[PDB]
Design a protein around this ligand. Structure first.
Ligand code: HEM
Ligand code: HEM
Ligand code: HEM
Ligand code: HEM
Lengths: 141, 146, 141, 146
């Protein structure tokens, strides 16, 4: 469970992301595709080439959802009901994959938020992505 | 694949008693039921809405038999799984777009199926041998992944 | 979450275990030690030999805990709190190992309850062990 | 490894710029903080009650240097990690009782530390090569487990 310190940490860090969330969304996806090529199986319909507009657009979407999550850190389940639905009943992404995107997101934030990416912030964000992952796979079965 | 001679004899001995048609259908059906997200590859199979609809679906049964068929063949080339499974590995990646995690889920389900069928005969050590085998097969199927 | 159906399935299957819970617990452990040798790192102090009284004793303890979770299927977080605390703070078993034991418990049940180990029941028991595992890991960080 | 000459050169090249002293201490400390259960092996180090207490603990920093040291040397035997880590693999199993999953956690932490340190320089393709390395090391270290 996210402690109040955790929620503070997350809000701070994401606060710094600002207008770059979309680019970081796209960068984390690109990192995911390259490091864990099994993830590519879910995007056969995308052009996964570097700088593809499909990837950029999708990066924006993900980033935005994260934003929304941070904003409703207190009520994630409710804030992401729709998204949990979509993933559980349509997309049906295997749950193992969430950990992979989560890791690529940490790497991306670390690479871009040197000062802010302290050990305590690192711990909080990991927990955060974990919770988000939990929420997104909660209606799978 | 660290299959000791005794592990290999154990796999082969038991495999002798299996009705691949039967186990094939049971293993695939159970996969679709325990991990419903796996149903994503079979929207052309029809009604998979309940356990009976899945377990008895003529398409699931026929596909199961096909899968276990390829698996059986693999068991005769324990020495060269990667080679054995290469074209299938490519197809699952490039044509079917099947996340390899699917291969591990099926392996675990199959182990439960063998336990279900053999009872006491599926001893701790026999299980350990089959655990190595399903892992080796899932690895071989993922090998051409890119 | 467990549905009414899941709950019925679990109460039923576990009902059949009855007095063999202890032995099935010990058997699940042994299966785990043989199949996933990495799990042995947590029992350096045990005699893991076949028919070990330590394993017997431990198998019973685990089985009792599961039986207790079934008895309190509507209040697992509270019924297992103590055990949740122990694992998080003392034992500190890596979370990945829960899945391994879960799997070995399913194999054991399958090997012993052929008539009851139906697809529906298998699915319910898997969701159940997953929930128990989640409770036991909930206070880790 | 299944490293591409280009993947080998990228690994090698970045490594050349690494302060093992600093990266080793940071990687291990981050491990103890993000995944608190890993502290189970370092009770004798002292006070690990807070990020600050962990990050400042000299015993942590010194063990961190030892671990990255050993890692650093394995980068010179990238084509036989198994053989390089054989003795360390036995020790970790038979003497230390360290679950190999810890090797994986550290690996990922290491990658976050490198991205942290190198910013821009730590590109998607460079990360991909490091991911292969960390997985390779974890496997080598786990190889002798029984
Ligand atoms: C941090 C967790 C995640 C979040 C917040 C997230 C969010 C989203 C969002 C916002 C969408 C777009 C919905 C729409 O089109 O209206 C989406 C779609 C999608 N997601 Fe998830 N996602 C996550 C994890 C994953 C993972 C790990 C994968 C697979 C590796 C994945 C696979 C997909 C796919 C294939 C689509 C549809 C893409 C398309 O066809 O446009 N998601 N996700
Ligand atoms: C032991 C592992 C497996 C083996 C040996 C295996 C074998 C096969 C074979 C022999 C075929 C037919 C090839 C062809 O059409 O030319 C096939 C097709 C297929 N496999 Fe696999 N398979 C395995 C696991 C899986 C799993 C776990 C899934 C998904 C959960 C899967 C999804 C599919 C699909 C969707 C098809 C095509 C069905 C169709 O004709 O529409 N396979 N597999
Ligand atoms: C859902 C699964 C699990 C249940 C129900 C469970 C339950 C228990 C219980 C009831 C005890 C004894 C506490 C006491 O002394 O009263 C215990 C101890 C222990 N468990 Fe867990 N546990 C589970 C998973 C695991 C796993 C997966 C591992 C590692 C592979 C593990 C490692 C241990 C260890 C090392 C001890 C201490 C044993 C001793 O020194 O006597 N547990 N567990
Ligand atoms: C990159 C992976 C790792 C490498 C290369 C590595 C290497 C080493 C080395 C070289 C030693 C020195 C011991 C000796 O020679 O007597 C050591 C000790 C040890 N390692 Fe590992 N290690 C790794 C990962 C880990 C992890 C992830 C943990 C637990 C979180 C761990 C726990 C320990 C402990 C507890 C000791 C004993 C230190 C002492 O004697 O106080 N190691 N390791």
């Amino acid at each position: 469970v996210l402690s109040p310190a955790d929620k503070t940490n997350v809000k701070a860090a994401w606060g710094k992301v600002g207008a770059h969330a979309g680019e970081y969304g796209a960068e984390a996806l690109e990192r995911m595709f390259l490091s864990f090529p099994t993830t590519k199986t879910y995007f056969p319909h995308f052009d996964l080439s570097h700088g593809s507009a499909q990837v950029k657009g999708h990066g924006k979407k993900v980033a935005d959802a994260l934003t929304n999550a941070v904003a409703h850190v207190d009520d994630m389940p409710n804030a992401l009901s729709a998204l949990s639905d979509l993933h559980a009943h349509k997309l049906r992404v295997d749950p193992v994959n969430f950990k992979l995107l989560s890791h690529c997101l940490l790497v991306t934030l670390a690479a871009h938020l040197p000062a802010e990416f302290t050990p305590a912030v690192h711990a909080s964000l990991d927990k955060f992505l974990a919770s988000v992952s939990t929420v997104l796979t909660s209606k799978y079965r | 694949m660290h299959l000791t001679p005794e592990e290999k004899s154990a796999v082969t001995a038991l495999w002798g008693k299996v009705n691949v048609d039967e186990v094939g259908g049971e293993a695939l059906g159970r996969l679709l039921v325990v991990y419903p997200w796996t149903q994503r590859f079979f929207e052309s199979f029809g009604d998979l809405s309940t356990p009976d609809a899945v377990m008895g679906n003529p398409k699931v049964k026929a596909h199961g038999k096909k899968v276990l068929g390829a698996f059986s063949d693999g068991l005769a080339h324990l020495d060269n799984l990667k080679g054995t499974f290469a074209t299938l590995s490519e197809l699952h990646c490039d044509k079917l777009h099947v996340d390899p995690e699917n291969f591990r889920l099926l392996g675990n389900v199959l182990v439960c199926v063998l336990a279900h069928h053999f009872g006491k005969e599926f001893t701790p050590p026999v299980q350990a041998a089959y655990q190595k085998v399903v892992a080796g097969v899932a690895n071989a199927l993922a090998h051409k992944g890119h």
